[PDB]
Scaffold this active site. Structure first.
Site, mmCIF file in Angstrom:
data_model
loop_
_atom_site.group_PDB
_atom_site.id
_atom_site.type_symbol
_atom_site.label_atom_id
_atom_site.label_comp_id
_atom_site.label_asym_id
_atom_site.label_seq_id
_atom_site.Cartn_x
_atom_site.Cartn_y
_atom_site.Cartn_z
ATOM 1 N N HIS A 350 0.758 -1.253 0.000
ATOM 2 C CA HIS A 350 0.000 0.000 0.000
ATOM 3 C C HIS A 350 0.790 1.307 0.000
ATOM 4 O O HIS A 350 0.183 2.361 0.135
ATOM 5 C CB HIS A 350 -0.888 0.036 1.232
ATOM 6 C CG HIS A 350 -1.924 -1.020 1.256
ATOM 7 N ND1 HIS A 350 -3.162 -0.836 0.695
ATOM 8 C CD2 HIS A 350 -1.933 -2.258 1.807
ATOM 9 C CE1 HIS A 350 -3.889 -1.919 0.881
ATOM 10 N NE2 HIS A 350 -3.165 -2.801 1.552
ATOM 11 N N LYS A 541 -8.965 13.905 3.862
ATOM 12 C CA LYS A 541 -7.993 12.801 3.887
ATOM 13 C C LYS A 541 -7.004 13.121 5.016
ATOM 14 O O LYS A 541 -6.944 14.265 5.472
ATOM 15 C CB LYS A 541 -7.250 12.679 2.563
ATOM 16 C CG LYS A 541 -6.427 13.926 2.259
ATOM 17 C CD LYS A 541 -6.458 14.364 0.826
ATOM 18 C CE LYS A 541 -6.079 13.283 -0.134
ATOM 19 N NZ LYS A 541 -7.162 12.846 -1.052
ATOM 20 N N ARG A 542 -6.206 12.158 5.444
ATOM 21 C CA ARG A 542 -5.205 12.439 6.487
ATOM 22 C C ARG A 542 -4.220 13.548 6.035
ATOM 23 O O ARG A 542 -3.928 13.705 4.839
ATOM 24 C CB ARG A 542 -4.410 11.166 6.843
ATOM 25 C CG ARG A 542 -5.247 10.130 7.560
ATOM 26 C CD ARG A 542 -5.619 10.554 8.987
ATOM 27 N NE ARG A 542 -4.429 10.545 9.831
ATOM 28 C CZ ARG A 542 -4.113 9.605 10.731
ATOM 29 N NH1 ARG A 542 -4.917 8.565 10.991
ATOM 30 N NH2 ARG A 542 -2.986 9.743 11.418
ATOM 31 N N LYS A 547 0.366 14.589 0.330
ATOM 32 C CA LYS A 547 -1.002 14.859 -0.149
ATOM 33 C C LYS A 547 -1.206 16.335 -0.533
ATOM 34 O O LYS A 547 -2.181 16.671 -1.190
ATOM 35 C CB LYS A 547 -2.061 14.355 0.856
ATOM 36 C CG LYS A 547 -2.033 12.837 1.032
ATOM 37 C CD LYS A 547 -2.777 12.379 2.286
ATOM 38 C CE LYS A 547 -2.948 10.860 2.426
ATOM 39 N NZ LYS A 547 -3.864 10.254 1.352
ATOM 40 N N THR A 649 -8.673 6.175 -2.308
ATOM 41 C CA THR A 649 -10.091 5.743 -2.423
ATOM 42 C C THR A 649 -11.115 6.849 -2.209
ATOM 43 O O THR A 649 -12.257 6.748 -2.715
ATOM 44 C CB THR A 649 -10.405 4.618 -1.439
ATOM 45 O OG1 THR A 649 -9.941 5.012 -0.157
ATOM 46 C CG2 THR A 649 -9.684 3.394 -1.816
ATOM 47 N N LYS A 653 -14.982 7.794 -4.117
ATOM 48 C CA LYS A 653 -16.214 8.149 -3.401
ATOM 49 C C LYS A 653 -16.814 9.430 -3.953
ATOM 50 O O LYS A 653 -18.023 9.525 -4.135
ATOM 51 C CB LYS A 653 -15.959 8.303 -1.895
ATOM 52 C CG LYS A 653 -15.322 7.093 -1.209
ATOM 53 C CD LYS A 653 -14.822 7.427 0.195
ATOM 54 C CE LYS A 653 -13.985 6.287 0.743
ATOM 55 N NZ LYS A 653 -13.373 6.606 2.014
#
Ligand SMILES: O=C(/C=C/c1ccc(O)c(O)c1)O[C@@H]1C[C@](O)(C(=O)O)C[C@H](O)[C@@H]1O
Ligand SMILES: *Cc1c(COP(=O)(O)O)cnc(C)c1O
Length: 809
Positions: A350, A541-542, A547, A649, A653
């Site tokens: 992952h 998201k975290r 990111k 993911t 969504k």
């Protein structure tokens, strides 16, 4: 009220009402005069659970009688969220329970909000495990999720003075009506001790014992009467533990601390002994259960009856533990045991960030798990003998592929262990799986090319459409029926409605209704006042540097500065929402949260801006908050540096729920754009190859600062205290990192991001064309069902055929 929620028949409603009253009186020991809203929730939950149990008992019997190959999904994280509504959806009971509760004078949605999230995961990896359980049950597979029943899940996030504060998630305080304690399947787990060699092989002796007590949770499939099991282990001391007297009893807590708390580290490996204990605990308990169940059907058939899927390296000790049991206890010769092990185990990777890889110090394994360390050394020696025969004289390849890393402290590379001991290794999106073959695991791919696969991630359309967005589910169902809920490729049929004026209006109306409802939730629970006509621009998201929440922040400040420069010019109004948790020890992530709140403090109180721009930090992002905000989003921000987000993911969504996406060509974004058409996606920035080219030359952030006046103005605002007036230097760590030590090249994508954001605004001014593009995204989202993902695992890794047939009710 709406068709996708099922029938509310007269017999059913009557029966639900009587069972609700029975549980309120006998289970909760209350009458209507002293019943609290929490009592009503519990009465409802017990009522719904009663409908699971017959199906649960019948499913487990069916697996005993038929004896299928069993799939064991091992994970340190299951991010389940709430269970009540999901259970109603999958048993087709939602409309009946709504009508039943209405008739008792209650609002079922209000009772739903009382349930705690089961927050037993950090983010994407934990949620994928939850989506996978739902899909395995819906596809009729004989599947078990195995993990740890943490007493405290992911911390509750509070924001105080714009800073993250953590508080304990005591999610079990009021009880959990979904789980069933199974104290009769309690098993011993061993630690420490030493190894004695004898005539009859090795023996692991003088160990400390901790008991593993299982708790089972039902996992219902979609309207097929299958109910599978998630088994979670809790740590218990033995009754003679340490047995002055008082201190011995209090010291039982030391053993029980194993299952006390979820480590909150997304992507930063720490070699803590307690975490290693958790990893072994889950593996040792689970494997005994597996072998027990297998014996109640000779180990040559073990891989025909058992598949073990390793969710990252966290349960990688399954490999040497399986070898220990087969060799030391069952007395199989090494080579035979190894063949069984390899054919049984498979590993999913992952992430490619090197700091996230598990590399345990040898001295820790030596003290805690001495027999396992011996087995690992033996695995390594035999593995390298094979490498040497395939690539003779290639001595540097031998050091690169070794399971044992030499250095100041010797460490075991757990990823290398998983590749050696697994018949399949997969990444989680096409680009990621390719990257594994070309870079970090290139040597392993060259030795055993057949092991390497791709399985692109997905999400369950039960939770992530029907449950959270019934309005959207219904307008789809009106045109194409209900079959798409368990066969999401049927959404392609929606392309024939792209020019249908009624369908366009309905799609846009549903988004507007979701936005109004979300705006109201904001005012109620968080005293915050947004303009629901604005474009809802969301990044949830975290919080991590890769990111690039910081890139979003730079864009927000750019719009603010443009407004201040030309205040009487029209601009498309936005509500920019950012949310997510930071790991408690990750300083830079905490600074980023504070920056977002400090931007909010300036922008939200500037009268010249008005209702044209608002910046909100969404506190305590979790599965239940994702179900509220995602249906309300217009724009999905998926802006990781190319090469860093393995899949994503959240991205999927948002696509399913009628947001458009602004993103890089990273992870599953690549495949999403390919399915929808690049013309229906807002793609910008460096591709992987551009990042590679910049690395070869050397990234110099100064060049961008020197050439882009708008970027230079922002950096000077940050430096001089414009956003931290009482602490002028508050953000100098952020400035320093961006200018001198940015691994993720935020400035290098700034110009293209800002320009692409102008194109988004331009399309938003034309609602009809905005909504047409949305329809093209929703219509092509079918590939990203976790039902497709699971079917591929089942056929290409586990060797089992999925089923859509109902079990008898
Ligand atoms: O969540 C994690 C990692 C958790 C983790 C790592 C090390 C630890 O030591 C740890 O405790 C957790 O990765 C996810 C995985 C992912 O959502 C998915 O396939 O499901 C795809 C995403 O791109 C994302 O990067
Ligand atoms: C889907 C989901 C994630 C993963 O989101 P990414 O954007 O893919 O990192 C994290 N947290 C929660 C609560 C989710 O529902």
């Amino acid at each position: 009220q709406i068709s996708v929620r099922g029938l509310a028949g007269v017999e059913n409603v009557t029966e639900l009402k009587k069972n609700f009253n029975r549980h309120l009186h006998f289970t909760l020991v209350k009458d209507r005069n002293v019943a609290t809203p929490r009592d009503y929730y519990f009465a409802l939950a017990h009522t719904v659970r009663d409908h699971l149990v017959g199906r649960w008992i019948r499913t487990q019997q069916h697996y005993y009688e038929k004896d299928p190959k069993r799939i064991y999904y091992l994970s340190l994280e299951f991010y389940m969220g709430r269970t009540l509504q999901n259970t109603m959806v999958n048993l087709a009971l939602e409309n009946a329970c709504d009508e039943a509760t209405y008739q008792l004078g209650l609002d079922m949605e209000e009772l739903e909000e009382i349930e705690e999230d089961a927050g037993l995961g950090n983010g994407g990896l934990g949620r994928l495990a939850a989506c996978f359980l739902d899909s395995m049950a819906t596809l009729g597979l004989a599947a078990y999720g195995y993990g740890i029943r943490y007493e405290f899940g992911i911390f509750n996030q509070k924001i105080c003075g714009g800073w993250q504060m953590e508080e304990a998630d005591d999610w079990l305080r009021y009880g959990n009506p979904w789980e069933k304690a199974r104290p009769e399947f309690t098993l011993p787990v061993h630690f420490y001790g030493r190894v004695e060699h004898t005539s009859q092989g090795a023996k692991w002796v003088d160990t400390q014992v901790v008991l593993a007590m299982p708790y089972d949770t039902p996992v219902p499939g979609y309207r097929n009467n299958v109910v599978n099991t998630m088994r979670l282990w809790s740590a218990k001391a033995p009754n003679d533990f340490n047995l002055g007297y008082i201190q011995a009893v209090l010291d039982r807590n030391l053993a029980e601390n194993i299952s006390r708390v979820l480590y909150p580290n997304d992507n930063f490996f720490e070699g803590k002994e307690l975490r290693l204990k958790q990893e072994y605990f889950v593996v040792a308990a689970t494997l005994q259960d597996i072998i027990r169940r297998f014996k109640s059907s000779n180990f040559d058939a073990f891989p025909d009856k058992v598949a073990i899927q390793l969710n990252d390296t966290h349960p990688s000790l399954a490999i040497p533990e399986l070898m220990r049991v087969l060799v030391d206890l069952e007395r199989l010769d090494w080579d035979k045991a190894w063949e069984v092990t390899v054919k049984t185990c498979a590993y999913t990777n992952h992430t490619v960030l090197p700091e996230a890889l598990e590399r345990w110090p040898v001295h820790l394994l030596e003290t805690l798990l001495p027999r396992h360390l011996q087995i690992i050394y033996e695995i390594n020696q035999r593995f390298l003998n094979r490498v040497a025969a395939a690539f003779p004289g290639d001595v540097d390849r031998l050091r690169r592929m070794s399971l044992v890393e030499e250095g100041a402290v010797k460490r075991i590379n757990m990823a290398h262990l998983c590749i050696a001991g697994s018949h399949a290794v997969n990444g989680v999106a096409r680009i990621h799986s390719e990257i594994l073959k070309k870079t970090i695991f290139k040597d392993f791919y060259e030795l055993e090319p057949h092991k390497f696969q791709n399985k692109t991630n997905g999400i369950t359309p039960r939770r992530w459409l029907v449950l959270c967005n019934p309005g959207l589910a219904e307008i789809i169902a009106e045109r194409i029926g209900e079959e798409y809920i368990s066969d999401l490729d049927q959404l392609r049929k929606l392309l024939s409605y792209v020019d249908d004026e009624a369908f366009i209006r309905d799609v846009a109306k549903v988004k507007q209704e979701n936005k109004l409802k979300f705006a109201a939730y904001l005012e109620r629970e968080y005293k915050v006042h947004i303009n629901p006509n604005s474009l809802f621009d969301v990044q949830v998201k975290r919080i991590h540097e890769y990111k690039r929440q910081l890139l979003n922040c730079l864009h927000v400040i750019t719009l603010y500065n443009r407004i201040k420069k030309e205040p009487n010019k029209f601009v498309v109004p936005r509500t920019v929402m950012i949310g997510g948790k930071a790991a408690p020890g990750y300083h830079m992530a905490k600074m980023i949260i504070k920056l977002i709140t400090a931007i909010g403090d300036v922008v939200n109180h500037d009268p010249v801006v008005g209702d044209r721009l608002r910046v909100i930090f969404l506190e305590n992002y979790r599965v239940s908050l994702a179900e509220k905000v995602i249906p309300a989003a217009d724009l999905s921000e998926q802006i990781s540096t190319a090469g860093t987000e393995a899949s994503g993911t959240g991205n999927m969504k948002f696509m399913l729920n009628g947001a458009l996406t602004i993103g890089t060509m990273d992870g599953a974004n690549v495949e999403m754009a390919e399915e929808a058409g690049e013309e229906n996606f807002f793609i910008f920035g460096m591709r992987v190859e551009d990042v590679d080219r910049l690395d070869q030359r050397g990234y110099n952030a100064q060049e961008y600062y020197d050439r882009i006046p708008e970027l230079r103005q922002i950096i000077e605002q940050l430096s001089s205290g414009f956003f931290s007036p009482k602490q002028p230097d508050l953000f100098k760590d952020i400035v320093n990192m961006l200018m001198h030590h940015d691994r993720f090249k935020v400035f290098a994508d700034y110009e293209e991001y800002v320009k692409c954001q102008e194109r988004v605004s331009a399309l938003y001014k034309n609602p009809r064309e905005w909504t047409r593009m949305v329809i093209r995204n929703i219509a092509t989202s079918g590939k990203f069902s976790s039902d497709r993902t699971i079917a591929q695992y089942a056929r290409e890794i586990w060797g089992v055929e999925p089923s859509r047939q109902r079990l008898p009710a």
